[PDB]
Structure formats: structure tokens, C-alpha cells
């Protein structure tokens, strides 16, 4: 069975996720509206920028993160922002229509929409396959929330300094994950290995996005559609 | 009477203004919506950012501008952007309600709205007085359009290099302005002097804004509400 510290970590992650994710997608009415040339780029850039804010709120509540140096926190966030977002967006992905359905016709992001944000099929093909692969896993909230924090606490990212300390933190979320699945998830003899496989997929999706984002950011007519936060997090400083 | 070159300059400015100003305020539906803490800041920053794009389209069509060096064009635009915008916004100012009325309840920008964009009364007091002062002048389109280009072509701005060449260009819009008023504006024996007085007012409003904008830009929680264009044009690079 699980230990006190191991369930404290679980209670904390679940609570943080609930404080930083909105199943109603209310604040989407505050974004630059969608348009369907790169019509969808302003709305989706607003979506990402918003998500980065929520990821930072999540990250600040992961046990041990707040005690890293500010550089290591930035290093981890710059490298893992897009992955955590790809991770949390699974909560809105629908298998019926292969789209993210954040509400009604306007906020129903299908494949043609994502291409009108300046991204090609080379990103879209494995991203969707990753989503339905993730959706089929039927994760519990604890596993989902643990996967996000495990991904964020990866020490194999550029710019990290204290990679033994954050490997320590990562090495222990994985313990909580393995213990949770064994005690509390029936029929999950294979689930942990499959979740760790998704982390590898995300590394690949990360590189494909940042490659296409480099192309957007180098074209001022498109980079001006971005937000300061986006440009800061995804920039090269 | 007016000369061929002097009316060519008039035809060009009037046409450029018509190509870069929309009396329907259609594209306002594309901005981040208004909210009424600095609630109004995202929508108004989107408004300014849009206006900067239209000012650049105007400026490119002023005779002689396109032949300045790219540095001088940038120098002129960075220093005079807010003034030209304060100038063009008079076309939407209403004396009945002392507000800019770009359409219906949402895009009716009154005094309380501008304060919810992080600007104090020290800017708002003389800006409104400038607007009704400008409104009472009852300018013809030619004078309005000429005032904008005269203001933009001021050589008394930081960063300009070829200040004799642009003083030459400015010194001749003023000629077209004086000639237009004499030949074609009845009862305007005093109008030119009064218009040149407005240029001085704008210098003062310019400094009051950029002083309050420096305060916004130094607070990252507010500067992140700005657009890249805004931050580029109003930045210190």
C-alpha cells in the first residue's frame, strides 16, 4: 500500500491541476477570436500563451519545484512547456471527431484549424496519434497529473544546472506513479511502461514543434501575432 | 489658387487615409474583447497595435517618405506614432458624450475605460481637451490628412539623421496646408496658426503617455498584455 508522503504528493498534484485547469474553457472568450494566410494563428497563440500561464501555476505547486533555483525553474519550463501543454490538452481531445472540443463550434479545434496556425502535417500527424494513444490509456487523474509533473521534472533538458537534484525529484514522482498504479489501478500491469513511452513521444513532438516555431518566429509578420510570453518561453535567450 | 504639385500631394494623402482608416470599425471584432486591475488593457493594446499598422500604411504613402532611409523612417515612426494615433482618433470622438464611439456599447471608449488601461488622469485631462479642441476646429479632410503628415514629418524627434531633408518635406506640406486653407476654406484666416498650435499640444501629450507607458512596460504582468508591435514601437531600442 501507499505511504503518507506518497499520497501527500498525490493530493498536492491533483489539487494544483484542479486550480490551473478549467473544464468549462470559460476564459476562451477573452482570446482573440478564431477565424477560418494563418487566420487561426492569433487565437491559437492566445490559447498557448494562456496555457503557459496555467502550466507555471501547476509547476509552482509541484513539491520541490519552488526550492529549485530560479534559473533551473526557467530552464525546466522553457524546455517542457509545449509537452505539458500537449499533455493537458488530452483532457479536451475527443475520439469521436479527432479534435479538441473546448466548447461549441468556435472552440472546436480540428485538423484544418491547426494548419491555419502555420503548422504543417509533420507535426500534426504524430501529435494526433499521440493524443488518441494517450486517450486510450484511460488514465486516472492521479496518473495524468503525475505524468505532467514527471515530464516537467526531466533533467535531460538544455539549460539545467542541478540535474542531480531534479533527477532526484523526478525519480520519486515515478515511485509515486508506480506505487499508485499497483495499489490502486486494476489491470495496469503494463500501464507504467506505456506512460513512460509517452514521455519519449513528447520529446519527438517537442522537437518537431520548436522546429516549425523557429520558422514562424523568424517571419516578423507572423511573430507579431504571438504574445510576449510565447516569445519569451519559446525564444532562444 | 493651388498648383498641380500641391493638389497631387493632397490627392495622395486623402487617398492614403481612405485606404488606412475604416469608418465602420469592423476589425475591432478581431481584438481581444473589452472588459469593464487593468481589465481594458488587452483590448486597448490591441487597438493601439492595430492603429500603428494603419499609421505605417499611411506613412508609406506620404510623398517623399518612402525615399528616406529605413532608419529615418523608423526614427520618425517611433517618435510620432502616438501623436498620429491621437490625431486620427479624433475622427471617432463625439462631443455629445466626450468619448470615442467606434460602435455600439462595446467599442464606445469613455473616460473610465481609458483608466482601466493603466493610464492616469494626468494623461486623460489634456488629451480630452485636445480632442474637443480639435473637434471644434471642424477640419476638412485635406487639413486633417495634412496635419497628420505634417506631424509625422517633424524633424524635431530623437533618432533622426537627415533632419534637413525631412524638414524640407515638412516645410512643404505646410505650404500645401497654408495654400489649401486660403484658397478653399472660407472663414479660416486663423485656422493654420491654430492647427500648428495643436502640434505643440501633441508633443506634450506624447511625453505624458510615454511616461506612463514606461511604467507599464516595466511591470511584466502588464507588459505581457501588450503586443510585440507595441513593445517594438514604444520600446527603447
Amino acid at each position: 500500500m501507499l505511504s503518507d508522503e506518497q499520497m501527500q504528493i498525490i493530493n498536492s498534484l491533483v489539487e494544483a491541476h484542479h486550480k490551473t485547469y478549467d473544464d468549462s474553457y470559460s476564459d476562451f472568450v477573452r482570446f482573440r477570436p478564431p477565424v477560418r494566410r494563418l487566420s487561426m494563428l492569433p487565437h491559437l497563440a492566445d490559447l498557448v500563451s494562456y496555457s503557459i500561464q496555467k502550466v507555471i501555476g501547476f509547476a509552482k505547486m509541484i513539491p520541490g519545484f519552488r526550492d529549485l533555483t530560479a534559473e533551473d525553474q526557467i530552464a525546466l519550463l522553457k524546455s517542457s512547456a509545449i509537452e505539458i501543454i500537449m499533455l493537458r490538452s488530452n483532457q479536451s481531445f475527443s475520439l469521436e471527431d479527432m479534435s479538441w472540443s473546448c466548447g461549441g463550434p468556435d472552440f472546436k479545434y480540428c485538423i484544418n484549424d491547426v494548419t491555419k496556425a502555420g503548422h504543417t502535417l509533420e507535426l500534426l500527424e504524430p501529435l494526433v496519434k499521440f493524443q488518441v494513444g494517450l486517450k486510450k490509456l484511460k488514465l486516472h487523474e492521479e496518473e495524468h497529473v503525475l505524468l505532467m509533473a514527471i515530464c516537467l521534472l526531466s533533467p535531460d533538458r538544455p539549460g539545467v544546472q542541478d540535474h542531480v537534484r531534479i533527477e532526484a525529484l523526478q525519480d520519486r514522482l515515478c515511485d509515486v506513479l508506480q506505487a499508485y498504479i499497483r495499489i490502486q489501478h486494476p489491470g495496469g500491469r503494463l500501464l507504467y511502461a506505456k506512460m513512460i513511452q509517452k514521455l519519449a513521444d513528447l520529446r519527438s513532438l517537442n522537437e518537431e514543434h520548436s522546429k516549425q516555431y523557429r520558422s514562424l518566429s523568424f517571419q516578423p509578420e507572423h511573430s507579431m501575432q504571438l504574445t510576449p510570453l510565447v516569445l519569451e518561453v519559446f525564444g532562444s535567450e | 489658387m493651388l498648383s498641380d504639385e500641391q493638389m497631387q500631394i493632397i490627392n495622395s494623402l486623402v487617398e492614403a487615409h481612405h485606404k488606412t482608416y475604416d469608418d465602420s470599425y469592423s476589425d475591432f471584432v478581431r481584438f481581444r474583447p473589452p472588459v469593464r486591475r487593468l481589465s481594458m488593457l488587452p483590448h486597448l493594446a490591441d487597438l493601439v497595435s492595430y492603429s500603428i499598422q494603419k499609421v505605417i500604411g499611411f506613412a508609406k504613402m506620404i510623398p517623399g517618405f518612402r525615399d528616406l532611409t529605413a532608419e529615418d523612417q523608423i526614427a520618425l515612426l517611433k517618435s510620432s506614432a502616438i501623436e498620429i494615433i491621437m490625431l486620427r482618433s479624433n475622427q471617432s470622438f463625439s462631443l455629445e458624450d466626450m468619448s470615442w464611439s467606434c460602435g455600439g456599447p462595446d467599442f464606445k471608449y469613455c473616460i473610465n475605460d481609458v483608466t482601466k488601461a493603466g493610464h492616469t488622469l494626468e494623461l486623460l485631462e489634456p488629451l480630452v481637451k485636445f480632442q474637443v479642441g480639435l473637434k471644434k476646429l471642424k477640419l476638412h479632410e485635406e487639413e486633417h490628412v495634412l496635419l497628420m503628415a505634417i506631424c509625422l514629418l517633424s524633424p524635431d524627434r530623437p533618432g533622426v539623421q537627415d533632419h534637413v531633408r525631412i524638414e524640407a518635406l515638412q516645410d512643404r506640406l505646410c505650404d500645401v496646408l497654408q495654400a489649401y486653407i486660403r484658397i478653399q476654406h472660407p472663414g479660416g484666416r486663423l485656422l493654420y496658426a491654430k492647427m500648428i498650435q495643436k502640434l505643440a499640444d501633441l508633443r506634450s501629450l506624447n511625453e505624458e503617455h510615454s511616461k506612463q507607458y514606461r511604467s507599464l512596460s516595466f511591470q511584466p504582468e502588464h507588459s505581457m498584455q501588450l503586443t510585440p508591435l507595441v513593445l517594438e514601437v514604444f520600446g527603447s531600442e
Binding site: 530560479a70 526557467i74 519550463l77 522553457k78 510576449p228 510570453l229 519569451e232 535567450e237 | 511584466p220
Partner: peptide, 9 residues
Amino acid sequence: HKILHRLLQ
């Protein structure tokens, strides 16, 4: 990363 900084309090 000053925005990030302020967001990281």
C-alpha cells in the same frame, strides 16, 4: 525571462 521570473513570483 523576466515575465517568467515574475510569474514564478
